Amino acid sequence: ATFHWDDPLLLDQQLADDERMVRDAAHAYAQGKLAPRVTEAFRHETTDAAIFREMGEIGLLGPTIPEQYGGPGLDYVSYGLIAREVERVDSGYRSMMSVQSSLVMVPIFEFGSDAQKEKYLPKLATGEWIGCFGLTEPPGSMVTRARKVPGGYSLSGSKMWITNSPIADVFVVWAKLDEDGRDEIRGFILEKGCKGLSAPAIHGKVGLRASITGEIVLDEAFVPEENILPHVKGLRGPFTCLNSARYGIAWGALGAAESCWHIARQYVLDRKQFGRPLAANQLIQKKLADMQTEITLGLQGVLRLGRMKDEGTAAVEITSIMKRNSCGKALDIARLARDMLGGNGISDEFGVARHLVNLEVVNTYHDIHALILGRAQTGIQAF
Ligand SMILES: CN1CCN(C)c2cc(CN)ccc21
């Protein structure tokens, strides 16, 4: 009976009560604690490690990790809802969280020994320990290498653009290990302090400036026998992690899109031209209709995918659909909002220009998703 412009399909009514509470709690935290930081943190590339303990203590880290290991044992829909509330403020904040959850806690939980899971998960869940994921190098063609030696492994190689690394306590590092007749990617857990490991910070970034990033440099770093992930070998290792992170990013990007939309709408409401508000312009109306439309549909898409993952009916290709669409439409929206603004950086509306440069990086983390889908439709590979 009543129209809700900000939620046309009443996504709010499609959610379970525990999901709603999880969403409202993430919203209260993001707006209450991340929003006051973000303008200055982005402008100056401020490092604030204290954020992990804030997130971990309300159960924002590793949302799907079971209570046995300190997680809040929430479903995929809750995870997406959290990502969306945090990225509503800033993608850099979302990125801290998605690394901790999908790139660190997930491989340890899924592939780790009982011993690894009890040691690492509870502190990753509270944010007492900060994690990072060492995959990218400066996948099938990585060069970081583990050598078998008395008592474990010796690692040499370099990882680049590693979110959290200069503040990380725990490092999940992927490296080739040839043993028996097979050279295969394996995962190793390293700890801050380990000899032959350093994590210099990278500064002067264009986007994601509110998030600290660095390298992982390994110079014959020794890893105890019980720090190798026993239950995974090859591409499946990192792929399981990225698939999980992509799902969170599919939701997150829509939160940033909604911020640029709301800023755009408020701006045209406040501004007048030719004696009428800008909101009276026909073309402005079309842009606002487009923004509303793509966000509204994108949300139905990620909600449905979440529901499918929770019931185990979701193939991995569906994540490619939603990841590509959320990131691509969020970027279009950020650009459409940007091109509506006539100023140059002083006013509140230039919050849009921050989301924009953030989404420009996120979108580049090749169009491989279109190729995954193309192969799934045709049976023919073009990658
Ligand atoms: C002419 N014009 C219009 C508005 N605008 C943002 C701008 C900004 C600069 C340099 N920041 C120079 C010219 C203009």
Author numbering: 4 to 141, 147 to 373, 377 to 394
What does the paper say about this structure?
Glutaryl-CoA dehydrogenase (GCDH) is an acyl-CoA dehydro­genase (ACDH) which catalyzes an intermediate step in the metabolic breakdown of lysine and tryptophan. Unlike other flavoproteins within this family, GCDH (EC 1.3.99.7) performs α,β-dehydrogenation as well as decarboxylation of its sub­strate glutaryl-CoA to yield the product crotonyl-CoA. Transfer of electrons from the glutaryl-CoA precursor to the electron-transfer flavoprotein is mediated by the cofactor flavin adenine dinucleotide (FAD) in both prokaryotic and eukaryotic electron-transport chains. Like other ACDHs, GCDH from B. pseudomallei (BpGCDH) exists as a homotetramer with tetrahedral symmetry and possesses an overall fold similar to that of the human enzyme.
Additional structures of BpGCDH resulting from this effort were obtained by soaking apo BpGCDH crystals in drops containing our Fragments of Life (FOL) ligand collection prior to data collection. All fragments identified by screening which bind BpGCDH occupy the pockets that bind the glutaryl and flavin moieties of the substrate and cofactor, respectively. In three of the four ligand-bound complexes fragment molecules occupy the binding site for the terminal glutamate of the glutaryl-coenzyme A substrate. The crystallographic water coordinated to the Arg97 side chain in the apo structure of BpGCDH remains in place when FOL544 is bound, but is displaced by FOL239 and FOL6421. In all three of these cases the Tyr373 side chain is rotated approximately 90° from its position in both the apo BpGCDH structure and the human ternary complex. This new position appears to facilitate ligand binding by providing a parallel aromatic surface that aligns with the heteroaromatic rings of all three fragments. However, a conserved backbone deviation is observed between the structure of apo BpGCDH and those of all four fragment-bound complexes in this same region. In all four fragment-bound structures Thr376 and His377 are flipped out of the α-helix observed in the apo state, partially occupying the binding pocket for the adenosine moiety of FAD. This perturbation results in a new orientation of the catalytic YEG motif. Thus, the binding of small metabolite-like ligands induces a conformation in apo crystals of BpGCDH that partially fills the FAD-binding site with protein residues.
